Design an enzyme around this catalytic site. Structure first.
Site, PDB file in Angstrom:
ATOM      1  N   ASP A 135      96.524  72.874  58.631  1.00 37.78           N
ATOM      2  CA  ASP A 135      96.837  72.922  60.269  1.00 37.78           C
ATOM      3  C   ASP A 135      95.427  73.315  61.006  1.00 37.78           C
ATOM      4  O   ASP A 135      95.336  72.757  62.194  1.00 37.78           O
ATOM      5  CB  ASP A 135      97.989  73.498  60.582  1.00 37.78           C
ATOM      6  N   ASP A 322      93.345  57.512  39.886  1.00 32.19           N
ATOM      7  CA  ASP A 322      93.238  58.538  38.642  1.00 32.19           C
ATOM      8  C   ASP A 322      92.801  59.887  38.936  1.00 32.19           C
ATOM      9  O   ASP A 322      93.158  60.878  38.207  1.00 32.19           O
ATOM     10  CB  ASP A 322      92.045  57.702  37.758  1.00 32.19           C
ATOM     11  N   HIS A 443      97.000  55.516  29.230  1.00 30.70           N
ATOM     12  CA  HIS A 443      97.674  56.075  30.494  1.00 30.70           C
ATOM     13  C   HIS A 443      99.012  55.344  30.554  1.00 30.70           C
ATOM     14  O   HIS A 443      99.014  53.967  30.128  1.00 30.70           O
ATOM     15  CB  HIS A 443      96.778  55.561  31.430  1.00 30.70           C
ATOM     16  N   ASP A 445     100.744  53.824  32.775  1.00 31.74           N
ATOM     17  CA  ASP A 445     100.582  53.041  33.725  1.00 31.74           C
ATOM     18  C   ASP A 445     100.110  51.452  32.945  1.00 31.74           C
ATOM     19  O   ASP A 445     100.333  50.408  33.592  1.00 31.74           O
ATOM     20  CB  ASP A 445      99.999  53.143  35.270  1.00 31.74           C
ATOM     21  N   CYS A 617      95.369  50.971  38.789  1.00 30.99           N
ATOM     22  CA  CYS A 617      94.241  51.822  38.516  1.00 30.99           C
ATOM     23  C   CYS A 617      93.471  51.911  39.688  1.00 30.99           C
ATOM     24  O   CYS A 617      92.578  52.933  39.777  1.00 30.99           O
ATOM     25  CB  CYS A 617      93.680  51.297  37.343  1.00 30.99           C
TER      26      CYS A 617
HETATM   27 CA   LIG Z   1     100.248  75.400  57.676  1.00 30.76          CA
HETATM   28 CA   LIG Z   2     102.094  72.106  58.634  1.00 36.52          CA
END
Ligand SMILES: [Ca+2]
Ligand SMILES: [Ca+2]
Ligand SMILES: [Ca+2]
Ligand SMILES: [Ca+2]
Ligand SMILES: [Ca+2]
Ligand SMILES: [Ca+2]
Ligand SMILES: [Ca+2]
Ligand SMILES: [Ca+2]
Ligand SMILES: [Ca+2]
Ligand SMILES: [Ca+2]
Lengths: 635, 635
Positions: A135, A322, A443, A445, A617
């Site tokens: 933030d 990846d 993989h 996938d 991928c």
């Molecule tokens: Ca935060």
């Molecule tokens: Ca936040």
């Protein structure tokens, strides 16, 4: 707890009674002799209970006091015990009590409003988020790495705990409240007092003397976690309030009352392909413009934000699948997406840190950041199923799936143990190990994907299938098209006729072996996800074995697709054209269109496929978190 | 698992079927067209099942094969599937099957004879011991530190696992068996093949190709664990057998079948004072001869071996309680005592390594061995309750008890986290933290002890009690003896009269504070052990506060006693003599003799008491393991 107060005719005793506490009386230990019996009288704010009028002086007889409201002043409630006998005038022992309220409160019913932690929809205990976003628009650190709350927005991520006192005005003349956390857990939590916010507990301090006035007071604290559940942290954090008697200036402080709240730290949770998409990721590199327009179109049709990483940041790493996986964390007061950044650390190394992490977007990483890694640590080898119920037991968030070898050898690869342990310690998507080491890249996938379906369980498992492609191609030869060419539509690529593909015996042998590797996972998935054959669709797909007899896609691996709701971005096989159309594309559409799915075939041949990956991928997706609340599972 | 076999009229298929496995048939995927229906015929050793005569060709129809015995030779059982239609002559697809037996077996019913591990008397799963003794009469290492079985006795400590095969004589021409363990767990187990024994799995090797003949064969393995359950090891070890098809010399090996056994590693378990004694420990030092004769007498009366550590080994460390704790580990095939050696590391440092560990005596240690330690890590601060049931939940081995501060401060002490974690990870004696930091030395043995009792729950909790001593002494003054002297019978010690002790107001204040510290634990124990007041006896005992306002025994701390069944070795208080006898000794006898207990009062004054410990602190006991089997608990 509950205290036991020893009364004496010798002199009056003085004691504090915390509301909600069991207070008991020992009357016999100093009952003077002469005496057979006793009576109790007390002021109106004290409730007296006697099990096992007036009573005999039997030590097994039980006397308990509870107090209805906080005292306005010290000793304002009294108890008088009267001992008497056959010819013995009554003798009185006095007890002056002060009642106080000390409630350490938190969101234990998991509704956003303010013992032990239990799972399930009838369970109890508050939730706490790892404050792993940024933030703070200035720097490059997760909010929870320093000892301050720098933006007021940051507080929305934190959990509110309130201390609520009711005492006489002078009470904290002779008593003091201390808030604490075990040394064991102090490196995993940070607590701020809201007066503006200042740190009272954390890695540096495990206890803090509180400054509390007499009377009614409410003191708000804000709590953040700093570590996810892991091998050495089951995920619970206990914060305790202790009340101390400091009356006597010569003696040590003496504990009178303790109470606690127990928080569970929210796990990192993944989202399957069946969850609605929200944002799509990819790289722009040299000569991949047309791939990106098809991906752009498809995003647009799925109502998704798009996000592209230019080659100045990529450092020529096009494999956006990846380096990262986008999950979320979730509490009653706040849900936010969190990127799990793979220790892969190739050219996209910075992308998760620099561009994904930020306001309301969290970050986590595991495993060694220089060396000690393998291909199996790349996140095309990290997937998750849709929700499933397996022989009674519900997995309402699905189960994470990741690839492994069938047994460890000198030549086998595995996902790094630190990743495996992290994933298991999240609990709520009980990982399943699949067999993927037979693939060159390795993989999951590369051989499975999942898609929404309007019936049955809500989805279908798609698996690559040589069998299906041999059957398709044999069918075509049977109806006259043995002459038809694979790789029709491609320049600098040697076309092959259906008939020579069907008669190539090595190729057929390689695909038999692949067929076994995939069948093995098929049954594994059927067992560990409770799937039936009617949950599964085979996608026609050929492979070949290459260096170290590892498998690669013979033509573009169609199962390695981008799933954006009903819109699919399937690699373009460039199959033999028959009756105006690629028979592979046609076979796929015939299997997927009855489920409401729309198949768009994207050309990735010289851009992706020849560098041993496809559309899935080269992309990534953030998706909508489940609505089912993780804490309601019983893992 | 269970495999799915795909049949074709194209050519016959060949497959292996492991007995106990679900084998299924896919008949529809290559059923030729023309065709509506199918029949199955099979040889007599194959059982065919069809849910959902002859059947339609519906893909949802389920066909399963099970095989009654191992094959004598390759493909000796056959299945023939017949596809036919309205005007279509039957077409046959053939399946040649070879049946084999592969049973990886272990003591999963916990009876000494040869999925998942479950607790309880209806649970399942084998047990494994940490091979932490030293049956090797030569060196100074635990048996499990090297990669060999050096004595045949050593094998009694290990768990037997047997692989049992039945195959055609040539089966292992085209197949190979591999035994393995996860890399995750290979540093915690070592497996030996019994042919003489040689290592096949361990820290160095996670998989091994087995050399197995065709026909009937039985191969015995012997397994040892190398680590106790701990923070980073929940205690389960899985060993797997995998069957590989190696038929094709060009292709990689292909997995056909896996099976596993899961072992739980046995926890370290302590023994309470209520368990019959077997061996007693102490130090001989300068001028302690008479203490040792009283201890010797008492041992003799309790039928116990005695064991003494001479001052050449002690290095003047007389505190035999503090450096070690004798527990056991237990499996169906073997139970043995194991010393938990404290990181205290004072003059008795060597005693556990050199003299306790040995044939059929195990060893374990935790925490840092140089520095980082406190007094609270000494094992007079490690105790365990008798068996108890607390609000329904049974603790059939009791609960470990150890002392702590009430909250962490700059001046507080704790038992080291590594010890705490180790104890919790043993699970079966679910530790309870008590408050002991108020004592100068800081040990739970300084204020509690437990003793057998012939009624109620089988025991009494003894607690030190200033209250009880003030009441005793006040009583005596009341009946005329205010003049009587504490420390009567001692030279170079200033006697004090009962009347001056009762009137000393600082002393009474100090003991009030102690009284609160002990009351606090009283209630804690009442809650966490389910005790009632009738389980508890108060022992009359005075304290005083000294450096840092920490508590010490005012006269010899009688609760710090040696409990050898009904024979008690209680520190000699040297109380005021009244009517021929120490009134403290008399008060104690009056409380303990009605329980069948015999109290012998041992003089430890200038030997132990003035160095701030008593009889319990100067001794240690090995006791009989519980008969209740730990794995039958449901923790
Ligand atoms: Ca935060
Ligand atoms: Ca936040
Ligand atoms: Ca911060
Ligand atoms: Ca990375
Ligand atoms: Ca992924
Ligand atoms: Ca050995
Ligand atoms: Ca041994
Ligand atoms: Ca030691
Ligand atoms: Ca042994
Ligand atoms: Ca002990």
């Amino acid at each position: 707890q509950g205290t036991l107060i020893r009364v004496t005719p010798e002199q009056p005793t003085h004691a504090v009674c915390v509301l909600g506490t069991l207070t008991q009386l020992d009357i016999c230990s100093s009952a003077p002799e002469d005496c057979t019996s006793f009576s109790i009288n007390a002021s109106p704010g004290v409730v007296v209970d006697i099990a096992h009028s007036t009573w005999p002086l039997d030590p097994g007889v039980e006397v308990t006091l509870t107090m209805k409201a906080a005292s306005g002043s010290t000793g304002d409630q009294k108890v008088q015990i009267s001992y008497y006998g056959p010819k013995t005038p009554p003798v009185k022992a006095l007890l002056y009590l002060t009642a106080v309220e000390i409630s350490l409160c938190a969101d234990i019913t998991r509704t956003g409003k303010v013992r032990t932690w239990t799972w399930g929809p009838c369970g109890q205990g508050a939730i706490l988020l790892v404050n792993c976003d940024r933030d703070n628009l200035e720097s490059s650190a997760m909010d929870c790495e320093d000892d301050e709350v720098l933006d007021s927005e940051d507080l929305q991520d934190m959990s509110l705990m309130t201390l609520s006192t009711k005492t006489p005005k002078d009470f904290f003349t002779n008593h003091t409240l201390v808030l604490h956390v075990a040394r064991s857990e102090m490196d995993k939590v940070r607590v701020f007092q809201a007066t503006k916010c200042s740190v009272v507990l954390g890695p540096k301090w495990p206890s803090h003397y509180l400054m509390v006035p007499g009377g009614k007071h409410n003191m708000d604290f804000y709590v953040e976690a700093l570590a996810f559940p892991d091998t050495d942290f089951p995920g619970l954090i206990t914060l305790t309030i202790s009340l101390l008697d400091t009356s006597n200036l010569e003696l040590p402080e003496a504990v009178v009352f303790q109470d606690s709240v127990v928080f569970r730290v929210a796990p990192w949770i993944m989202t399957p392909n069946t969850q609605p998409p929200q944002e799509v990721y990819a790289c722009s590199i040299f000569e991949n413009e047309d791939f990106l327009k098809s991906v752009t179109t498809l995003a647009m049709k799925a109502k998704c934000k798009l996000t592209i990483c230019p080659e100045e940041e990529n450092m020529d790493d096009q494999w956006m699948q990846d380096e990262m996986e986008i999950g979320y964390i979730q509490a009653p007061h706040k849900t936010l997406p969190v990127v799990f950044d793979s220790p892969r650390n190739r050219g996209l190394k910075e992308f998760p840190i620099k561009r994904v992490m930020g306001p309301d977007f969290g970050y986590v990483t595991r495993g060694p950041q220089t060396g000690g890694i393998s291909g199996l640590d790349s996140f095309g080898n990290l997937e998750v199923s849709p929700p499933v119920t397996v022989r009674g037991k519900e997995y309402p968030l699905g189960r994470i799936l990741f690839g492994d070898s069938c047994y460890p050898s000198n030549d086998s690869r595995q996902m790094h143990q630190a990743l495996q342990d992290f994933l298991s310690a999240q609990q709520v998507q009980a990982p399943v190990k699949l067999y993927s080491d037979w693939l060159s890249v390795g993989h999951v996938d590369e051989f499975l994907s999942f898609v929404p379906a309007p019936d049955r369980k809500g989805f279908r498992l798609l698996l690559a299938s040589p069998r299906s492609c041999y059957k398709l191609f044999q069918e075509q030869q049977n109806e006259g098209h043995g002459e038809a060419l694979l790789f029709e539509g491609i320049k600098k690529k040697k076309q092959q006729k259906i008939k020579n593909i069907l008669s190539n015996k090595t190729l057929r042998e390689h695909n038999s072996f692949v067929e076994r590797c995939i069948d093995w996972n098929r049954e594994l998935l059927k067992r560990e996800l409770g799937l039936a054959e009617s949950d599964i669709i085979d996608i026609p797909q050929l492979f070949k074995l290459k260096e170290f007899s590892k498998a690669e896609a013979f033509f573009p691996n169609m199962v390695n697709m981008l799933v954006l709701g009903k819109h699919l971005g399937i690699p373009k096989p460039f199959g033999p054209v028959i009756n105006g159309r690629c028979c592979l594309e046609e076979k796929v559409c015939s299997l997927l269109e009855p489920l409401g799915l729309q198949c768009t075939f994207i050309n990735d041949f010289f851009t992706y496929h020849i560098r041993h990956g496809e559309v899935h991928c080269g992309t990534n997706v953030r998706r909508k978190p489940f609505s089912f609340k993780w804490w309601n599972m019983v893992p």
